[PDB]
């Protein structure tokens, strides 16, 4: 190409030498012809040794790579720019992936010139700033280095950056003409406070390490194979003790099975260059295929020592990891890691809404996974927010906070969680009226805006004492023992509060104490007398305390009451329940005591146990109109609770009036069913409230867990059993009854009839179920069979016809073999 | 605790900040007192030999570091004297790194002074670690250190009479065993003084 | 402020060798405050500059 081509001719006039050979370019100068000082070996230089003279003949400093410079900058330009909405995890995986590919072999080539190294600041700057653009934040204080880098499941994107560095720029153009000096090198990292990140360049192997590596290692394997050839074979673990990982020609690679035995003589460079110029794209292969060569890029101390430089457990404490890990304290060992990549999605390419919603959760997982972004108060445009009916402090991204946090908080029931902790203290205090001689203890009216106002105080419950609460300084709950004055006036009443924010920086002492002295100093709402007890709790990392007066019979009382109550609260059951539900990553324990076998025998004794199948709550009629479109019109459903011992069946019918105006009717059937079951439980006096509830669906499990928080005695469990309440339904009862149902109403049903008199509840239960799946397949032939004689009749007030026990047995055999036939 | 955290930050910044010659601004920016200077030199050598391979950045950081102040090069002389007491206590793979760093600083010769006298143990008394490492550092330091000017200039520097095993003439085992070990290690004509003197 | 009139870089191999010298006098490391108050000390881009207030 003439002028486009480059060449260099060394001679007596040219003091040094150079060339463009291979990538980047090369330079060398002899140590004898160098007049100034001697050869200075620091970073970019190289040792040129003469094997004939057995010494270092010259010093070779080569170059940086301009074509690879613009190739990496353009590779990140099309990489990040061509990448649209998607999970930042894989985005940083390809980012740091290919960036490490260009950083695979750099050493003195990239370390020499600072211009190529300066592009990495724009690389990582546009990377973390690109993820911040995806979060619609772009705030430096909202994304410290903690969320920038972390390996594996630690919560970080896994980006490996060599940001924290200062290029050796000295004396500007004066040194551009001088080319000798080191002073005032660049600036530093992007944002670093009293800390320095790791560097892959310092953790990589220089070309000299490959020189001496393959040299001394080539002599070790050389003489080893020599003496093995002259003497006997002796091929054993000694080669593994020879450090086969040293050098690019790794001995472990040539000693493999498919490598030495398989493949072939001609190397893989053919498909390397050719295929690199072929197919649909190229790749970052600077040496050879993984089969022909290897033992080059190994994380090791990069990820290990990276987590070592990271805060580790302290870093998770600075993040929201340990916050949601409060109740699952054993989750700190990274047991279940994460899951749910495929989930229910069909293949990969799908509708744009299914792809955006598919990338929603992981973006929301990494978004809501870091609280301090929307929690820790920052400068500039940071503003106050009220969230939804709970509270908020710092502003931030709309989808993270509102979308993810509202889904984690579920419905307004969080107010019933606060009132569930207050009522949990009121009901948790019983012997205190006898011990403290409380004259009158009455819970104050709980307003919906009282617990929702973070500025003002909160009224919990009212109590009394013989004289009054004995105490002097209303310090915090964690305060040490101090002299307690009497100061008896009238009475006292405990208060409560909660804080869902302040991930990184939070203090229950200063904020609880100073908050009680603040709201108590001014006049907003004061439930107790001027001498009283005020309790303040924080939802972050399961924090609880009290800023009120600590009495000798109060501080230990509410102390241990907050030890067990704060240990497991119903509101804390919703905290770990909805917490881990929103995480959907690490679950170290399964559910329990899910019904399997012994629950059938325990279903008939003297306890509770309810079977709830909502499958038929949602029923529709799909009819295609002749325009070519489907019209779906919902019809009335029903909600089911069955008693195995007594055969008592509960009927709650759902109507198109409450099916009207809403959407997502399956999930709405879940929440509506669980809410109605909760109301019925509240309506069947505590004796008629169940001990356990058996359901057939996890979509039954979660909403019941949400609505049932106010009765901790109730235990929720799932089951795989098959109960065609649908078959029965149509059959006779809800064919006529749901077909005719004009509105929601409720009726007590006995499905065993006289079986309880004739037979045991277990025989009625198993016979019941077998005859149920019967009532499907033979519902068809149960409407055939169940009247074996012409005079067989069903009484109007029973479920079943009257038959002799032998005929019942015949029905058992016929319908059981039916179930076997399917 | 102070040396554990100081070694954690020194190792964190050691594994980071490529071209450690620039990292000396951060190492000196730590502002460690004189009590942490000796422990920073010993732990600095521990991090130098803790790598999976010999790194020239450790030799440069030791050359500029020890070459900074007087107590620095002094800490390199005393720390090198304490390093000479390792012998068989040093690791086999780390012996090559100690020979590469000691050979790099010995090639410059600035900070080390009496290190040439502390070496060269007796004829038949050795741990083979200082003999093998002395052969590796003697071959590499002979190649890159200008062996003809290093041995010829070292003959008039009074380093040989200050060393026990390098003493020619009187002691027959020192000069003879030094000629057999030197000539057997590849010194060639460098042992002719002990050969003719013996 | 900004680079102002300067775009990125403008130089020449023959102009730099004529203006500067590989071997020259070295006394002080080119104090910027000396060139600030002395527009003749810094000849790079002397266009639209209000300066040279002598002493007090």
């Amino acid at each position: 190409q003439w002028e486009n081509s480059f060449v260099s001719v060394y001679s007596k006039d040219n003091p040094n030498l150079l060339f463009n050979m291979c990538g980047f370019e090369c330079r060398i100068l002899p140590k004898c012809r160098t007049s100034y000082e001697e050869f200075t070996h620091k970073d970019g230089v190289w040792n040129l040794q003469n094997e004939v003279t057995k010494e270092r003949t010259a010093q070779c400093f080569l170059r940086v790579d301009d074509e690879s410079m613009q190739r990496f900058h353009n590779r990140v330009r099309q990489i990040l720019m061509a990448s649209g909405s998607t999970t930042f995890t894989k985005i940083v995986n390809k980012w740091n992936t290919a960036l490490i590919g260009l950083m695979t072999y750099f050493r003195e080539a990239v370390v020499n010139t600072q211009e190529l190294l300066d592009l990495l600041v724009k690389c990582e700057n546009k990377i973390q700033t690109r993820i911040k653009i995806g979060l619609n934040s772009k705030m430096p204080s909202r994304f410290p280095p903690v969320v920038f880098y972390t390996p594996k499941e630690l919560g970080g994107l896994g980006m490996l950056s060599m940001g924290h560095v200062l290029i050796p720029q000295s004396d500007l153009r004066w040194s551009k003409q001088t080319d000798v000096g080191i002073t005032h090198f660049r600036s530093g990292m992007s944002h670093e406070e009293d800390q320095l990140i790791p560097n892959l360049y310092r953790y990589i192997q220089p070309w000299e390490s490959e020189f001496i590596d393959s040299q001394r290692v080539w002599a070790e394997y050389a003489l080893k194979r020599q003496e093995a050839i002259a003497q006997n074979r002796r091929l054993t673990l000694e080669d593994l003790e020879d450090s086969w990982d040293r050098g690019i020609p790794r001995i472990n690679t040539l000693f493999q099975k498919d490598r030495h035995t398989l493949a072939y003589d001609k190397g893989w460079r053919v498909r390397t260059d050719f295929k690199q110029y072929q197919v649909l794209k190229q790749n970052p292969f600077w040496w050879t295929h993984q089969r022909h060569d290897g033992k080059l890029w190994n994380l090791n101390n990069y990820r290990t020592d990276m987590i070592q430089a990271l805060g580790g457990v302290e870093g998770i404490l600075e993040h929201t990891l340990f916050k949601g890990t409060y109740f699952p304290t054993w989750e700190g060992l990274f047991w279940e890691k994460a899951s749910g990549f495929e989930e229910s999605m069909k293949w990969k390419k799908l509708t744009n809404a299914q792809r955006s919603g598919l990338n929603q959760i992981p973006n929301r997982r990494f978004t809501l996974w870091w609280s301090p972004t929307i929690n820790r108060a920052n400068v500039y445009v940071g503003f106050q927010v009220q969230l939804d009916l709970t509270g908020i402090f710092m502003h931030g991204k709309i989808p993270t906070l509102k979308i993810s946090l509202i889904q984690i908080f579920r419905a307004h029931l969080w107010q019933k969680i606060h009132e569930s902790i207050v009522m949990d203290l009121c009901q948790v205090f019983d012997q205190e009226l006898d011990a403290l001689e409380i004259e009158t203890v009455q819970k104050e009216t709980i307003h919906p805006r009282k617990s929702y106002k973070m500025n003002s105080s909160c009224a919990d419950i009212l109590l009394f004492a013989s004289y009054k609460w004995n105490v002097s300084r209303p310090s915090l709950l964690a305060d040490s023992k101090d002299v307690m004055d009497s100061t008896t006036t009238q009475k006292y009443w405990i208060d409560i509060q909660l804080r869902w924010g302040d991930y990184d920086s939070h203090d229950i002492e200063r904020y609880a104490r100073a908050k009680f002295l603040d709201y108590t100093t001014d006049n907003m709402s004061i439930y107790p007398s001027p001498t009283g007890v005020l309790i303040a709790i924080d939802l972050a990392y399961n924090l609880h305390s009290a800023y009120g007066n600590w009495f000798p019979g109060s501080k230990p009382l509410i102390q241990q009451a907050m030890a067990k109550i704060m240990k497991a609260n119903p509101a804390l059951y919703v905290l770990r329940e909805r917490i881990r539900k929103g995480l959907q990553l690490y679950s170290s324990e399964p559910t329990e005591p899910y019904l399997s076998s012994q629950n059938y025998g325990e279903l008939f004794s003297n306890q509770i146990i309810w079977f709830v199948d909502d499958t038929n709550v949602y029923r529709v009629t799909i009819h295609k109109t002749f325009e070519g479109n489907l019209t779906t019109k919902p019809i009335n459903g029903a909600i089911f609770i069955f008693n195995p011992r007594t055969g008592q069946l509960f009927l709650k019918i759902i109507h198109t009036s409450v099916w009207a105006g809403q959407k997502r009717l399956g999930q709405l059937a879940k929440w509506k069913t669980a809410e109605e079951v909760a109301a019925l439980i509240r309506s069947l006096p505590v004796e008629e409230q169940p001990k356990q509830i058996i359901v057939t669906r996890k979509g039954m499990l979660d909403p019941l867990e949400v609505h049932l928080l106010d009765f901790p005695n109730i235990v929720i469990k799932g089951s795989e059993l098959q109960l065609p309440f649908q078959a029965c339904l149509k059959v006779e009862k809800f064919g006529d009854l749901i077909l005719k149902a004009t509105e929601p109403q409720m009726v007590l049903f006995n499905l065993y009839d006289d079986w309880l008199k004739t037979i045991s509840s277990y025989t009625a239960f198993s016979r019941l179920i077998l005859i149920l799946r019967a009532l499907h397949v033979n519902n068809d032939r149960a409407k055939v069979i169940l009247k074996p004689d012409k005079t067989t009749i069903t009484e109007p007030h029973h479920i079943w016809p009257t038959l002799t026990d032998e005929e019942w047995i015949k029905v058992e055999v016929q319908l059981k073999d039916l179930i076997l036939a399917d | 605790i102070n040396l554990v955290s100081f070694r954690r930050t020194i190792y964190l910044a050691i594994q980071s900040s490529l071209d450690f010659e620039e990292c000396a601004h951060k190492l000196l920016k730590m502002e460690f007192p004189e009590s942490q200077t000796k422990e920073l030199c010993n732990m600095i050598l521990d991090c130098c030999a803790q790598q999976r391979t010999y790194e020239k950045f450790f030799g440069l950081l030791a050359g500029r570091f020890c070459m900074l102040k007087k107590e620095y090069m002094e800490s390199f002389e005393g720390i090198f004297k304490e390093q000479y007491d390792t012998i068989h206590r040093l690791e086999t793979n780390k012996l090559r790194n100690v020979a590469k760093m000691f050979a790099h600083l010995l090639y410059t010769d600035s900070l080390p002074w009496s290190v040439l006298e502390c070496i060269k143990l007796s004829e038949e008394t050795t741990t083979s670690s200082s003999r093998i490492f002395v052969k590796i550092f003697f071959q590499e330091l002979c190649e890159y250190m200008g062996l003809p000017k290093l041995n010829a200039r070292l003959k008039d520097e009074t380093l040989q009479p200050f060393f026990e095993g390098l003493l020619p003439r009187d002691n027959p085992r020192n000069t003879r065993f030094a000629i057999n070990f030197f000539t057997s290690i590849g010194l060639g004509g460098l042992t002719d003084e002990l050969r003719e003197h013996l | 402020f900004e680079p102002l009139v300067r775009d990125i870089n403008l130089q020449d191999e023959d102009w730099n060798e004529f203006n500067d010298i590989n071997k020259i006098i070295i006394r002080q490391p080119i104090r910027t405050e000396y060139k600030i108050a002395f527009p003749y000390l810094y000849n790079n881009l002397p266009h639209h500059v209000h300066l040279t207030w002598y002493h007090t």
Partner: peptide, 30 residues
């Protein structure tokens, strides 16, 4: 742009690295 070193655009890349002289530049100068 200080004497001998500076970045025309401080907003150009990351943040202005408050460089000094490096505890090693004095060692190389002495």
């Amino acid at each position: 742009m200080y004497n001998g070193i500076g970045l025309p655009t401080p907003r150009g890349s990351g943040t202005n690295g408050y460089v000094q002289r490096n505890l090693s530049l004095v060692r190389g100068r002495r």
